[model samples]
Target: KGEELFTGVVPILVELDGDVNGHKFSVSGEGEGDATYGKLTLKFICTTGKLPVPWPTLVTTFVQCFARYPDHMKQHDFFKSAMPEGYVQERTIFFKDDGNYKTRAEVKFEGDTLVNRIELKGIDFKEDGNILGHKLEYNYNSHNVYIMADKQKNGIKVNFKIRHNIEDGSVQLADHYQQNTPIGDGPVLLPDNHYLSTQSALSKDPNEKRDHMVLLEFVTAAGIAAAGKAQLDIKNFPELYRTTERVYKKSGQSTKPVTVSNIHYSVLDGYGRSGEAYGIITKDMIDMSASKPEPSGWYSYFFKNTNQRATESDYKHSPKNVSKISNNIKASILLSNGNVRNGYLFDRSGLIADSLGGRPFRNNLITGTRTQNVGNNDRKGGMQYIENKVLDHIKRNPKVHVYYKATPVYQGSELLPRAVLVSALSSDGFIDETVRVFNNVAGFNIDYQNGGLLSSSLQDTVYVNGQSDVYWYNKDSMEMSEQVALTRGKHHST
Candidate 1:
């Protein structure tokens, strides 16, 4: 942990699908990963197929041009951060206007949010040597971006300012797009889950295991947190490890893929697990009570990776290129009553187990003992708990179809204290808010006067972690593109 030297970077990405004039002006930024839609929504999915011009580079320029100029959206932050001093220093960016792939703009902090305007003297974009949009004229107030553009349609000009209605609070790619739509949907809007999967797959990996991790040593989570998680660490995963396998590659390379896998876990006896323990409760093991108890597993995440492939039919209801999130971003779980309970899962893996409060790198030593009792470390803590419990319960009980339906996580919105999210998990590592004593203290601000707003996920989620890198979209990202399959049985699948 750099302790006090981190400012996460959130890259702004815009998507378009409409037209400018009568020409086909489209940007594939509206899907998770379909043959037609981009894998990213609202957020830009630059390109998977190489183009004569680099979309990322091109888009970055557009973002720079759109972001720096103060507007109803810059109201969302990025490089042009919110004015702590009610003003940001003047700066001019000259990306170049060699006719293609060029952008230029100048921002000044010497004025007002509605009066001090910026300049975009040059901007020209040509995809594969064809002119798309060229700057013709420019003029605008601070809260607005009104650059002029001419894409040939008989000298017709469209204001580069945002075309969508920003008052609605949306950063998603509007169905209609024109010449050069600026930053109406800026970084400040990354968290609303518009780009993330609200619902996750409920399949459990056959070969995967709620790994019984016997950590020989580690640090404390008391003073550590990653970006997205710092904002809301609602559920703390109690198990040490969980497994998942995905993807394919055929040929002499078998074309593409792997099959067999396994690891020793039984040795960590006195060290079983919590969520790891998948068995139900027996009144015999607890203090006498005739009341029915609410038994919940180690708060099972609604979106863990699994070996099952969603039937092609499952993809029908989704967007052409919908991306899946395997981790717990607004993730939910299945209640015994068949209701959906949403919750945030803060599962600290081996890498993040030690971040601050203790030297993460200096010792490089695994000296301490971290024998975790992942899921009760015994037989009842079987890996196929859901199967042994739910599916089994569903089949065993014959009578009238046990009724069940969906329900929102009751009051989940009020779980974690927002006051405890930002600074402790990640910070600019610089200034201190009312109680945020950076280089000076070992903790965070109870209330940074909303000052923490400057470096919060409100504008920096790109650099923050979401869609969990581990379980992506409820499946391995590799599975999304490959012919991956489970070739082994109880052992690990490839």
Candidate 2:
């Protein structure tokens, strides 16, 4: 009783690695159906991470100063955005400073004959946070993203903007010379002597049009049209529930279109009871499919209680010194030819050390943990058991990895031990990998773990001072120190 399942093609994610500065990824696998296994190379670059002149003014001050000097305005969208007309004065100042995170992407794909490639030169923080990039370098093959599918019936939707890095000035940092180096200067630039007007630009330019990049849902015709044929089965995600579409029409019903509607989806799946055709895809059924004709894959993720530890105040939503981090981790398995599927995983966690606790009230909700027990654990020393079953639940999953982002908590709490990690089998809800991870984090010591970026073996305790505040760079001794003294305000970190 299945509808005609329409599928384009999809490749599995092999491996990925990157930082705020830049990243590189490689995928060696087969596409949809049974095709030859090839490789996709992807690179993301931020180009610059420099300290702004005039000391602490950094990012915001850069924009404001540029606003006053309208004559030098580069006509770039990033500039327009750096200080959008109505930005609060405080915010405006932050925009111009060259001290914010920047990111860009370029990719190349090698498939049968169609060697496709696309280079997205510039993308910034405020304009867009997440971007999907695919294609190949020497190959001019089209880059396609799924628009809609039968399973993800509702589809996915998004607002996209093209961008160019506006560069200027060479700056350095103070703390670690090795970590802080000089970066270039100039207005952030876009590709081919043009700049992205905003997040909605990929679909705006006529030349840039035609099956390359687009902001769209993964389950609709509009999305497919924008992504072209290469995008693969983006439209068929099973979790999509609903969508929205906007169509653009020329004045007076002219056939030509300007923009169209895109759909959005939500995650919802009903639960089932005992055996007998319940909603759950049983292991037996999936295992049986190992020899079946149709193709199938597995999707999984991990979760952390970003909000609240095991206390009443945490339950009441009070602030705390302890912090927890949870992010969307995803992966899939294709049974046909041993292809590992992939998707975005927002796996970032951090803590802002303070006397009240590491995180603010709102962050507490996102990073669950308790203050009192965390304090006691640091003093008497031992992993504070947030709950009896917390660790036990983590060991259940078979093949997933988990990471922890922590910061110093309590006035004298021990500085956070380096990040912690565990793995699981599901994407959301319930800690099903307790036993598996417990064996991994054994003895509360992570010195023997190794492999990938989550090297369980490099768990060495290196002491760092939470109170020794320093400049981002070490150029002007007294002047920079004074700047740091003045910039110190409320004890909050975002």
Candidate 3:
């Protein structure tokens, strides 16, 4: 309706009679702020429904794996050169024109038995760095087990068990192991039918006053890569090819030696290359992103579950039993990846373990970077007790032969030089200790058809002077020592 205004004597209020019902209200404006004669601009942030984003779309995958995108690579030969050994590796190749590529591994192992075959899987680049809302994570797991055997009606019945693990390597879930009763002899059997053992001794380094080994080193990269695989994969395995390296217990800021404690290697860096890449980011980033990191510094640690104490009496009279000693241990890898990630170390000699324990044991498990020693309460004299025990066993049963196994995982890769294995001098009456460079398994007789000693299968030759040509290791020794049981998995009796 057209508006018609008429001034009345007083202000009058009226309501439309057509559609207007029972509603009354008032509208007004108040308050003010600085105003300038300028055009007003309106802004609005629009958000649309998200797309189906999985991970680094195929585009990102290609760029990281092979294509030269944001950056080709930090180093020209960084890929191959960074590898601590001449390991065969796979690479993805993308051509600018074809826009086609493929994923493949360059390194491989020769064929062998199920117990001797070793598998080295490649790292998934897609899993590296942060992708979308999720940062890169190193997911790892491993199965540990033991195999014990005894004669049965049909043949030798083997007792095998397995342990499954899942965590950020902070602490093991202690997943129970599985059991398998496999038959027939597997791999190389050592004298006295043993699997693994831990032996220790005090070393004399002119640099330090105490008779200490001074420096103890380990290469976790290869050990971790070859896990779940077999020992033959490391046959002719060299010692220097380890990718990850560290000189622990250094005094002061210098790379000097420091006293360390029980460090376990139940599992290792299962990521790739050296697994150092997995621990490459700053400790801050790792702490913020990971459910947990490996204790103090990247290499140091504190107890997750406080470890129990071992009294002096325990070491004096007690026998070295896996049970009597508390498994409760606190360990850490407290070093930055920069220290060993991309560098190569001169890995010295190694121990050749045929058996793991006191008798009839197997050497199948491995250790990555961690180590643990049974407290003195269990072995008052350290390596001396174990040495004497071995010697006494040999005297009582001269037919028995003792041996150790050495596996070289990252050897022969076109990455870096290989690590070496050297033997040390042993104290007298103690088990023979000789230094030598060895390569191959021959001349040693292994007869599974008859009831025989396993140590007979290993050839013991000394390529040294003033030594007998018919000895396995040197016999001229000096002091008393302790024993160590180093295996891939948990320590157990056969």
Candidate 4:
């Protein structure tokens, strides 16, 4: 989570091939990883036909992919998480240099996008470290990122930009080359299938198999919503949680009003069991109904954690996670007309069933006389019925967005909000927009746990709550790197 590893200097080896400057030039130079391609140490043996400006010809090949080591590439998370399946590798190369020996170039990653920056800083060829002279001076500045949608039907779209400034000076080399270079083709972006194979390998260890279950969670609504734009409000939630309205047209060209509650509840179901039912309804479930009546058992298993323990930390206390799950469930109900269902009601494990671990923490608490049910007791009459009402309400006011807010840990440790996601529709029964706003909210805390019940003061940050003014991105505009860096700071809005 920290950028500590990236801060250290790394050794970069540059090997030159046949005939470049004037004579047959083949020399291997080592430079610090911290140096931009332009600032790299150029060790030339037979300096005749000129240094050949190695960056455009050398660095470009390895820069596109992160790892060069065989083991590291196999373990890279980006490939694990985002790479497309059965994907083919494609390369497009563009080169430029000053003919008058007055400029140089460099490249780097701005968030997920790669940037190529070229600059001119007058002429200074005699400086000791300035091997290539002023003609090779690099400007470690910036550029405009262009968002290009991947043209393949299901190809991953790359949103980035490329910019440079070097006209015909000393000697200009213009090579407009685009070629398909296969670094390595993949079996596919197959986390689910891969995890299944992993589970099979761990057949002797049921506990280990269960651990991999969490990885099966589908990358759906929340995934897409958070990736784009989502505003999260941590403090003053009630103010942020309210109702919103939308307009939908009916048959015969009649206009109808649709009122949607922007806020939803992630009520703490008793026992250690909670967050077992929260889910954001996704398009996958809707498509499932087009073919199957309900989500398959495999899909259901992907949603809930089977190994959740009662004493570790109560899910009921983590309102953030609870709310996320609850809203997802509500979204499913409303979007599917209560057709897309979850197995929580039928599966009596996790919170759906009373705990046998302890008494007070159990779903069934013996108070007065007759046995009383707790946990997700009133499934048929409680959340389910409420979900039904939401579905019916939305049916009447059919085009609206559901905005839910709360502070909860994402995955197991990280947390943040002002995270707002909108799922809207039109009169034609078509979902028009799904926008996520992430510009709001403060930075998140990692490796969280409840502060236990005996806090001397509520202001001293508890596992379940904390206080802070909303944080907003107030700069004129920012690149992805700037946005991410801001999250690591303590700045906020009034």
The estimated TM-scores of all candidates read 0.19, 0.17, 0.18, 0.25
Q: Which stretch of 10 consecutive residues in model 4 shows the poorest summed lDDT?
A: 194-203
Residue 165 alpha-carbon offset, candidate 3, angstroms: 12
| Best-to-worst ranking by TM-score | 4, 1, 3, 2
Task: Encode model 4's per-residue lDDT on 1-494: one tens digit a residue.
Answer: 11122233334433334332232433343333321111112221322334334332222222222221111112221222232111232333333432222222233333432322333222222232222332321211121111122334322223221222122223323232222121234332211111100000000123332111100010101112222222332221222222212221112332333332112223322112121111222222112222111110101111134332222233345533321121011111111123442222211111111111111222211111000121123333322222333344445554432222211111211111122233333223333333432311122221112211112200122122223212233443321111122122211232
Point out where model 1 deviates above 4 Å.
Answer: 1-50, 59-298, 301-494
For 429-458, candidate 1 gives per-residue lDDT tens digits of: 111111210110112211111111112201
Clash numbers, per candidate: 38, 101, 77, 34
lDDT of each: 0.19, 0.19, 0.19, 0.23
Highest lDDT model number: 4
* Residue 489 Cα positional deviation in candidate 1, in Å, after optimal superposition: 34
lDDT tens digits by residue: candidate 2, 335-446: 2234333432221121211221122222221121122123223332112332222333334542322121121111001111122221122333453331111111111221
The global Cα lDDT (0 to 1) of model 2 is 0.19
Error of 1 at 466 (Å): 17
Tell me how many residue pairs clash in candidate 1. Answer: 38
Using lDDT as the measure, name the better of candidate 1 and candidate 4.
4
- After the best TM-score superposition of candidate 3, give how far the Cα of residue 150 lies from its true spot, in angstroms: 33
Residue-level error in angstroms, candidate 3, position 316: 41
Q: Which stretches of candidate 3 lie over 4 Å from their true place?
A: 1-374, 377-389, 405-494
Q: Which residues of candidate 4, in runs, are more than 4 Å off?
A: 1-159, 162-186, 189-414, 425-431, 437-494
Could you tell which candidate, 2 or 3, scores higher by TM-score? 3
